[PDB]
Amino acid sequence: VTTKQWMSALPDTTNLAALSIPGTHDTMSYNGDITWTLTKPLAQTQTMSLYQQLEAGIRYIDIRAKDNLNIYHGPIFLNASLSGVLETITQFLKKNPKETIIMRLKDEQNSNDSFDYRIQPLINIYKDYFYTTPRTDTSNKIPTLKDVRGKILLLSENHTKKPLVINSRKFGMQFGAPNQVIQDDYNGPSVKTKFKEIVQTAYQASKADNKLFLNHISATSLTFTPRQYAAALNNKVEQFVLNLTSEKVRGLGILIMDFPEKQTIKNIIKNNKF
Numbered sequence: 264v265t266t267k268q269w270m271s272a273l274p275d276t277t278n279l280a281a282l283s284i285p286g287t288h289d290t291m292s293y294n295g296d297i298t299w300t301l302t303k304p305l306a307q308t309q310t311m312s313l314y315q316q317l318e319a320g321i322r323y324i325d326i327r328a329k330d331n332l333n334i335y336h337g338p339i340f341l342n343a344s345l346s347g348v349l350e351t352i353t354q355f356l357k358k359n360p361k362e363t364i365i366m367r368l369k370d371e372q373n374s375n376d377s378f379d380y381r382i383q384p385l386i387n388i389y390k391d392y393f394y395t396t397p398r399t400d401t402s403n404k405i406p407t408l409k410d411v412r413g414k415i416l417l418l419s420e421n422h423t424k425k426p427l428v429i430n431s432r433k434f435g436m437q438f439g440a441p442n443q444v445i446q447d448d449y450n451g452p453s454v455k456t457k458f459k460e461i462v463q464t465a466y467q468a469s470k471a472d473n474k475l476f477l478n479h480i481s482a483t484s485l486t487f488t489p490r491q492y493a494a495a496l497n498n499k500v501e502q503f504v505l506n507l508t509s510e511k512v513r514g515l516g517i518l519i520m521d522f523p524e525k526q527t528i529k530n531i532i533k534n535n536k537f
Contacts, residue, residue: 266320266525269532271361275409279416280472283504283515283534284365286323287316287523288481288489291334291348295341304488306336308481308521313348317355320528323365323477323517324352330378332385335371345385352415353392360413363394365517367438370421378421386417387429393417395432403442405475418443443475444468444516451484454495461500468516469507476516493522501527508534 264272273282292299293309311319326348329335334343352364370378386393394406394414406416417435419427427434439445446464448457461480468476480500482492497520504515508530518531 264537266529266532267318268359268362269320270322270363270408271359272537273408273535275412276407278405278407278472279363279365279411280405280475280516281514283513283531284322284517285320285523285528285531286325286365286477286517286519287321288325288479288519288521289336290316290321290324290326291341291343292336294343295336295339298339299336299341302339304490305483306339308489310522313343313351314355317352317364319523319525320532321523322363323367323519325367325369325519327369327371328378328382329371330375330381332381337371345382349385349389353389356392356413356415363408363411363414363416365416365418367418367420369438373422376421376423379423379427382427383429386427386434390429390432390434393434395434398428398431398433400433403436403440405442405473442473443477444471445477445479447477447479449479449482451487452482454492457482457492458496458499461496462503465503465507465515465518469512469514472514477519478516479519481519481521489521493520497523497527501530504531504534 287309289308292307299306327335328345332345334341392415394411394416418438420438426437446460448460461478464478480496483489513534513536
């Protein structure tokens with residue numbers, strides 16, 4: 264099947280936690296302002312544009328923004344706006360209505376509750392593309408593909424530390440909620456150690472089916488750039504996934520990468536049973 268519509272070929276009854284999903288770390292860092300070009304080797308995490316990543320099979324995106332509604336990487340403007348991102352995601356879901364996108368939306372300047380209010384008018388404009396549940400519901404249960412067809416599963420991360428609530432609807436869930444298991448050891452780990460943590464988290468994900476596993480392949484170091492880590496790790500992780508597929512082991516969770524290759528993305532998708 265085509266990477267452009269791989270999820271459409273899956274059963275409506277399949278739970279989101281029972282899948283192996285390819286994702287990108289700092290999705291929008293493939294372009295930026297003059298500061299981005301000057302610090303490029305340290306700041307860059309992708310080569311494909313948002314739209315190219317979606318067509319390549321990426322179903323998990325990591326979007327960082329500030330209350331001015333622009334996309335950032337710390338003090339670095341990424342030449343993109345949240346409205347631009349939402350229109351792109353929405354156009355993709357309109358063209359391929361059976362796919363679902365998991366989106367981490369982070370407040371790049373955690374210190375205010377103004378971000379929460381600012382993004383509301385924008386999200387509300389595209390509410391028909393967001394998986395939503397009643398405000399009076401704390402079940403935080405992971406949905407099946409039936410409930411998220413052609414929709415965005417939002418994972419909010421901000422100062423409030425609570426899910427985005429607009430009116431009487433709760434848009435998605437909170438990033439870091441009890442139903443999620445996160446491996447994000449980015450602070451200069453050795454390749455050997457980082458690989459162990461990736462493998463261990465993938466192993467645990469395969470055994471669980473009621474939790475979302477966000478497994479970060481990405482990392483940074485003063486002496487090692489995101490590009491260098493990815494060149495060492497993506498292939499190792501790709502071979503590991505290929506082996507587990509032979510062993511009939513599925514549902515490895517969300518594998519979040521920097522500079523993923525078309526090949527690697529396809530092999531992670533192939534881990535799911537069609």
